[PDB]
């Protein structure tokens, strides 16, 4: 209150069903995510950093792993 006028940024922790996949581009990170209520067509890969659900992420690679990288991790 009584400070800089708000007019930028407004991200909200929208409910996430589960990450569909994973793909990197340019150097960043983005995971496909199904959003509740919104039509499946409205798909949008959000940056991992922004994502506040590490548990879901692990859930995705958890199945693909046990072979993934074939090393540490």
């Amino acid at each position: 209150h009584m400070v800089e006028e708000v007019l930028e940024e407004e991200e909200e922790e929208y409910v996430v069903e589960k990450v569909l996949d994973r793909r990197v581009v340019k150097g960043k990170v983005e995971y496909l995510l199904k959003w509740k209520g919104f039509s499946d067509e409205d798909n949008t890969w959000e940056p991992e950093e922004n994502l506040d659900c590490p548990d879901l992420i692990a859930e995705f690679l958890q199945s693909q792993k046990t072979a993934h990288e074939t090393d540490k991790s």
Binding site: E9, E10, E11, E12, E13, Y14, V15, V16, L33, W35, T44, E46, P47, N50, L51, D52, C53, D55, L56
Partner: peptide, 18 residues
């Protein structure tokens, strides 16, 4: 009670409302 997983879809902008 535990918080359910959630991820910001970079909505931004502003709700249309009415």
């Amino acid at each position: 009670a535990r918080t359910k997983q959630t991820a910001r879809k970079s909505t931004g902008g502003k709700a249309p409302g009415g």
